[PDB]
Amino acid sequence: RFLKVKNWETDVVLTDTLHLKSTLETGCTEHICMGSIMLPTKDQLFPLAKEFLDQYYSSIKRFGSKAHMDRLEEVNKEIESTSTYQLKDTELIYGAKHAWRNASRCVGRIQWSKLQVFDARDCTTAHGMFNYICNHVKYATNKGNLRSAITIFPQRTDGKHDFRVWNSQLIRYAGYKQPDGSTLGDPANVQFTEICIQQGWKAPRGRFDVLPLLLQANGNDPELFQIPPELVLEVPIRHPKFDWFKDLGLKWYGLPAVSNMLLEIGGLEFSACPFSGWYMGTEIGVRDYCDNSRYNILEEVAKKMDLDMRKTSSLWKDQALVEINIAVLYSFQSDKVTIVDHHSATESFIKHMENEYRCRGGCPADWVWIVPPMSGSITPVFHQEMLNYRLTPSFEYQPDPWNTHVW
Template sequence: MTTTTRRKIAEQATAFLGEAYFELGKSEEDAKRRIQEVLEQIEQTGAYIHTYEELKHGAKMAWRNNNRCIGRLFWQTLEVFDARDVRDELGAAERIFNHMSYATNSGRIRPAITIFPASHSDNRLRIWNHQLVRYAGYRKENEIVGDSASLAFTDACQKLGWRGAGTRFDVLPLVIQLEGKAPKWFPLPQETVLEVPLSHPENSEFEQLKLQWYAVPFISDMALEIGGISYAAAPFNGWYMGTEIGARNLSDTDRYNQLPTVAKLFRFDTATNTSLWKDRALVELNAAVLHSFKKQGVSIVDHHTAAEQFLRFEKQELDHGRAVTGRWSWLIPPMSPATTGIWHRSFDDTERTPAYRYQAAPY
């Protein structure tokens, strides 16, 4: 490790610890003592080990700093599971399944993150999945069956020996790879995957479409960066905003492309754009998503409420002397954005740390 790299880690560690200890109500003496201890560790080893309290608060700060997340009002409720002691794939899988069960909570979803060994550790690992629960995508002769966003990962899973049933909604396995070893896959236990069949609050024929989605968005391919230390495996979850499912996953033409199907069911005129059939189908599909999740007792938020919550978050942060950063193009919902308060705002898109970072797929 170069002197420049050590210096950079030391600078990031000092900045994080100073901010975190202040927010945690620690004394200035405690902060200085801890910073000195960490600087000595970095000088000796090139890295340092977070205490659980630092890890916990750092993960929460990363959520608070996430410019692309509209749901940051609840950043302090994040449950942090420390899995830095994991040594093998089975142990990692068990921690993940425990996380999934805790977070799913029979539909009353709880935000959580499980943090695996740091990237500089000899027991570091990667999770191949983009999300812990995700539907497979299969290339057929003239069509794609399932989720086209999962085509590459589905191919990778099949090369590892996994076989799906070939339906539109096959749940992919969990794939874990320890550094220097071949990846291993594990089927997700049925009790860890809650799925919601979609129905419509007014149109009983909607169920004929046989649409569904999984209850919890577990993001599992991003790295968590805290004070110069990176954790390449740190799956986390909140709950869905309805438009993520209804206006993107099921509606995008390169995903499930269900707007023409929904329009046909509701007998909208698809011969001309001036009928606004896409807009009307989009509303009905999103109404079905919200109705179905609530019917099944599964946590979800509509985009109007989410936007109001974000503005409350901004006020809270300003009250604490912290300016809110954000990426406007991500904060506005993908449906009727001009009806939300966020539409009329602008935000500083500066990236702060701690943070969740994108990283290249390992397959």
């Protein structure tokens, strides 16, 4: 059926036909919606490869061409002979750009076509992976003028020689459990922070310690590496009015770079494919800094602001939240590091949706993730109905390595 999506603020209505090309299951059923659940063979492969190649040739205006047909047969024969196949560079670039295009949970997709793709399929060792990652970090950081990029390591073969970056992001802060029963640093990485130690790393036991990379190549055990500090751009956080803010001793890194997802293109699985763009302010100020299970700084900040924390109804958390988020944005802009606020990012996404609907017939989007975690309804995406469905190429979550690695 042809579904329609309405924005309840502008009344603009869009019709979605793209969803009619979805194949994978959503997790929901006619009886129960699971929209808020965080994570709901040669025979198998050729169909997948065919679906992919078809859309590629269609995108280059050569659908049904001999070239299209020729390639189809070559891959076909390749799979029949090798049980797998290799992607042409052009297909690789198109696939990664489209996996981002299809990421229903990403609000910054208006930038999808500008992705710099780094082919690391010729990599063979962890040191090799370290080199490639360093190069990615430097390229993307670009002295503060961030540029989107993805580095793609060798695809899965028999699942016993998988390339994996054990970190969750190329750059993250360590977390340590202390006597107080309390947590020092970032609670979200406590387990990884330990595995590095359990593997040799010498933790500075600080509040913002850049974690080391733990890289795995060809199934072998992972190895540690310290990203050259000169390559990790960090931003000290200060407020444009509260001089005491700096005394909080807060800082964040300028490069957001998911490193543990799985990229699927034409049935091929790329288990190590770190990518990066740049931050939307709220990611840091709202979630990293204020989540109860993260740096949880609202109470300290509220205290330094001297407001009545006695009654929830004084909205002191809300007041403080805004200030913390003003300071994150201020600092990044001051140090000339790329960053986007939730208002501009959501406005761009709405623009992107319109482009997509008219040029592609739709845009899968996950409302639950697209709406910023603060000031939801004053951003336009809150008022925008969205259809969530799965299209490939795609980025998917995958088991953490330490729960599957056979040392």
